[PDB]
Design a protein around this ligand. Structure first.
Ligand SMILES: [Zn+2]
Lengths: 88, 86
């Protein structure tokens, strides 16, 4: 069910690292990537997208945004999914 | 401007949810929920809370994410356009 190339925005990797990681995928032909952010990292996921958008401009498109609530530890935590497509 | 809710750092999630319901009860069809920086997470928290309370009674039209300039610095924002559904 949870296929594709999803990248979970980590609290331990900085924003620029995530941005560079996504472009590494884009460059090898993996044109669609999913950024996932849960809890406080939801803000970070948007930060990653913005940084990606600043350096790729018209070259990347935010296909859609999906927000929800999951399980995780013990209580319902919020999450966001930013689906990105590299465009030429 | 009058139907937009800026998520604040010093107010809890539930407080913002109530601010929306108050507008909905006031007969307002749509409300804009905005969060910038660290509060982007909270804005989504407010939505999931609103949905948990009103459920089918509320609908998210669209989500706008991007960056704006505040104090000569770039900051991220998220916008959740909500429809009352009455
Ligand atoms: Zn990395």
């Amino acid at each position: 069910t949870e296929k594709l190339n999803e990248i979970v925005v980590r609290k331990t990797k900085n924003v620029e690292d995530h941005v560079l990681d996504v472009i590494v995928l884009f460059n090898q032909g993996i044109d669609e990537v999913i950024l996932k952010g849960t809890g406080r990292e939801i803000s970070k996921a948007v930060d990653v997208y913005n940084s990606l958008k600043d350096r790729l401009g018209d070259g990347v498109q935010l296909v859609n945004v999906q927000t929800g609530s999951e399980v995780r530890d013990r209580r319902r935590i919020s999450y966001i999914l930013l689906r990105l497509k590299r465009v030429y």
